[PDB]
Amino acid sequence: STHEPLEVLKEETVNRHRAIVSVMEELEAVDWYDQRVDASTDPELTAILAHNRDEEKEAAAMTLEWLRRNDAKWAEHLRTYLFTEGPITAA
Amino acid sequence: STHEPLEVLKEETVNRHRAIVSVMEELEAVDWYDQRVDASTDPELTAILAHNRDEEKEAAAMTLEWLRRNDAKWAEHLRTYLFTEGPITAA
Amino acid sequence: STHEPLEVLKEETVNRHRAIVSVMEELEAVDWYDQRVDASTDPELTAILAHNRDEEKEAAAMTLEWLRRNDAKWAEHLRTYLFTEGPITAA
Amino acid sequence: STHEPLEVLKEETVNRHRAIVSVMEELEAVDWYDQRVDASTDPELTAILAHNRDEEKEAAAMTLEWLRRNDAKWAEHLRTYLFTEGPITAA
Amino acid sequence: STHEPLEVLKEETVNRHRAIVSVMEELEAVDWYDQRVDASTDPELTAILAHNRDEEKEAAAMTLEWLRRNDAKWAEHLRTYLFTEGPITAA
Amino acid sequence: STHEPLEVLKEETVNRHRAIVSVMEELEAVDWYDQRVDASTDPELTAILAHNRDEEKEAAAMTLEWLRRNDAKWAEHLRTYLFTEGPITAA
Amino acid sequence: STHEPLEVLKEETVNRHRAIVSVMEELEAVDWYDQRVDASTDPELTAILAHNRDEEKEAAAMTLEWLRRNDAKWAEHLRTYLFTEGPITAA
Amino acid sequence: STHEPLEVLKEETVNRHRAIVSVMEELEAVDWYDQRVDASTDPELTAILAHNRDEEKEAAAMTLEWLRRNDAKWAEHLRTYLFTEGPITAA
Amino acid sequence: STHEPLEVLKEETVNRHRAIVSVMEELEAVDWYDQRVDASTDPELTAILAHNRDEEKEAAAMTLEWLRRNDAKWAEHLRTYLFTEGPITAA
Amino acid sequence: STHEPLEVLKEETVNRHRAIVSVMEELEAVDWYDQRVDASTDPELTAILAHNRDEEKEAAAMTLEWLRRNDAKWAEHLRTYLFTEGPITA
Ligand SMILES: [Ca+2]
Ligand SMILES: [Ca+2]
Ligand SMILES: [Ca+2]
Ligand SMILES: [Ca+2]
Ligand SMILES: [Ca+2]
Ligand SMILES: [Ca+2]
Ligand SMILES: [Ca+2]
Ligand SMILES: [Ca+2]
Ligand SMILES: [Ca+2]
Ligand SMILES: [Ca+2]
Ligand SMILES: [Ca+2]
Ligand SMILES: [Ca+2]
Ligand SMILES: [Ca+2]
Ligand SMILES: [Ca+2]
Ligand SMILES: [Ca+2]
Ligand SMILES: [Ca+2]
Ligand SMILES: [Ca+2]
Ligand SMILES: [Ca+2]
Ligand SMILES: [Ca+2]
Ligand SMILES: [Ca+2]
Ligand SMILES: [Ca+2]
Ligand SMILES: [Ca+2]
Ligand SMILES: [Ca+2]
Ligand SMILES: [Ca+2]
Ligand SMILES: [Ca+2]
Ligand SMILES: [Ca+2]
Ligand SMILES: [Ca+2]
């Protein structure tokens, strides 16, 4: 799953890889859950996909907080733009 | 791109799709850049990959903030875990 | 995301399609989370990966129960083997 | 098919990997068989695809029972929802 | 799933397509099961994978027989080489 | 290529793997040639694609015969259904 | 299978597409076969893979001649280098 | 890459692998270039893609000549069909 | 990430690999951003996608300059065609 | 080949898509060709792979120049860093 050999990567780089790829899979799942919620024709199934959808968002937030704590630039940029107002392209 | 036909998906659901898949590509690039930074043997190349790495994080934070503003659950869970202390699971 | 056109697939068949692909993605996440839990070197991250792992199983269990209720054969074969004793094969 | 090197994965973990991916491929086959049963224009082929479809369901139930016996959380969450008559999201 | 538009493909050609991809998925499962039977360290699981392996072969034989009946050259070449003594390259 | 390391797979299992993936590629080629035969608008090309199509069937039959000779269950199931009459789900 | 809509692709361009991708599948099969011929441990299987290998070469040659006849530049460049002597890097 | 381990493949065979995949990638590019030439709406871009298209054909011819020189059955079949008149299937 | 073993690739060859694949993902990202800018229905998101798009171009320009400095042929061909007028295909 | 429907994509955007994917496939080929030159054991084949490699760079330069002419900020950023001296991050 890593493009470079494990012998040359820093231990922190591999851990962030494990954390980043997790966020990717969680973000991807939220998108697919949400699409199937709109297209679903069974309300009982829609409730399940909607419930798991929101649980993926929670998992994404957790891993993102971990990235924020173990990466200086994630902390800088996340603090710059998240929980703000006005244009997002200037903060 | 979307698993379900666009004619049955909401307009805001497709916008979030565009935002989510973007963050995925942003996170993926951060992971790959960081790995190549560790394995690179050319100092001038390492500087470029490290610079673009941090700009990918910035782009991810921007697109992530947009999701927070256009989805209540994203706002709920991101507020719960981001910028906190103590165990990330105990919250 | 379907091999046959939706203009010819029954309504129930597409709903099961949405549920099955969800179980696959949830089962897939359980496998990958567990692998990272063993390989992770950061306890803080391992705690997150282990928590999200177990909630994905819950999502799989929920979506799988729906399949049991909307397909006579899923109900027959699941009831045959789930929560049995002795060899899984013959019994 | 694993993502982390086997040298760091516990033996008990690799076996669960073998079972999970099997369930995925079996669940996937059910989805594709069922679609091709609806779209097929030859009754003889329809009989075969429908027969093998149900045989994949049987295989999934078997492998899924093995997971129930060799993973605590699978048994906990499967017990909560499988073979229940009330609403799923409230169990 | 198909490469050419469905409007120019004969209805029979599409039925054979549905049969062929099924055989491919069946053959694929037989190989993967067998590889996992050798590597599995849990007998309970090895027994399950071995059972489903042989059940996939049966599904492959059925779907292949349908191809033999709906294609002149499948019947010609299969009857030439299946169930023969001596070198296969000579019959 | 394979899924488990070749140092735990028995010699015979890997040989069958080589045969199975070969058969899959022949079946894959037959399905694609036939589709291009129906959609092609150039007679000289259709003749070539149709000729190579039938040569793939012959290659598949040869490899299948080898599987029959080197696997007891392939021989059992192929003998049951190949070259039969009546509903295929009855033999 | 095509990248641009068929509405704008000339009839002849789509036919060459069918011919080119066929050669690719032919070339791929030759390579796959040759590799398995070296690694196979069963002479009977090796004989089959070697036989089908050379027939894949023939199919590639046939489809390639068709390309030469239906494209002036294929004819120009193929004639320059095929059946020549001396260092190939020399028009 | 390769399907069998490099340590069991003959140097002879790996070189042809490198040559075959190159022809594959060049053939693929010729098809993609030709499609974009038909769909392009900018004459300047169409001229460039058409120019590179013909240069990919030349690269394929060179690599093919190398295959013809380092494989007897390539030399036999390429001579049978290339630069011939009359039906291709009867040559 | 590479096709040939790393122990046979020259050092400068692996660095250029890291640089080339980086440009690929950036070029890919520029295209995807632009497509979403056209399809987006939310002006706030469109501003973000447009902002990151142009910053991806800057990252590509940086990496390309590095390739120009670490490869004599990139420098030769880039100097021939970049920042020119008249028919590109001429020079 | 596109992710969004062609009816919402502007004409000029689809053309840049066609040009970008070409540069992508050409850059990929340069990398793959180069790896096979280092690992090849046949001098004749190496000469061919090395020859096509450098012409693939030429194809990339041509297509890349077209992007520079049909996209303002490609021209701006390429003008900033290409044919420069000293650190690139500056
Ligand atoms: Ca996933
Ligand atoms: Ca989930
Ligand atoms: Ca939770
Ligand atoms: Ca999750
Ligand atoms: Ca920035
Ligand atoms: Ca970016
Ligand atoms: Ca939960
Ligand atoms: Ca499968
Ligand atoms: Ca089956
Ligand atoms: Ca059974
Ligand atoms: Ca099965
Ligand atoms: Ca009850
Ligand atoms: Ca049965
Ligand atoms: Ca193939
Ligand atoms: Ca023959
Ligand atoms: Ca073949
Ligand atoms: Ca050998
Ligand atoms: Ca032949
Ligand atoms: Ca063939
Ligand atoms: Ca390519
Ligand atoms: Ca090329
Ligand atoms: Ca030339
Ligand atoms: Ca990407
Ligand atoms: Ca970047
Ligand atoms: Ca910048
Ligand atoms: Ca090119
Ligand atoms: Ca030239």
Numbering used by the authors:
A (entry chain G), B (entry chain H), C (entry chain I), D (entry chain J), E (entry chain A), F (entry chain B), ...: 7 to 97
J (entry chain E): 7 to 96
List sentences from the manuscript.
Our study reports on a new class of ferritin-like proteins (EncFtn), which are associated with bacterial encapsulin nanocompartments (Enc). By studying the EncFtn from R. rubrum we demonstrate that iron binding results in assembly of EncFtn decamers, which display a unique annular architecture. While EncFtn does not store iron itself, its association with the encapsulin nanocage suggests that mineralization occurs within the cavity of the encapsulin shell (McHugh et al., 2014).
Through site-directed mutagenesis we show that the conserved glutamic acid and histidine residues in the FOC influence protein assembly and activity. Analysis of each of the single mutations (E32A, E62A and H65A) made in the FOC highlights the importance of the iron-coordinating residues in the catalytic activity of EncFtn.
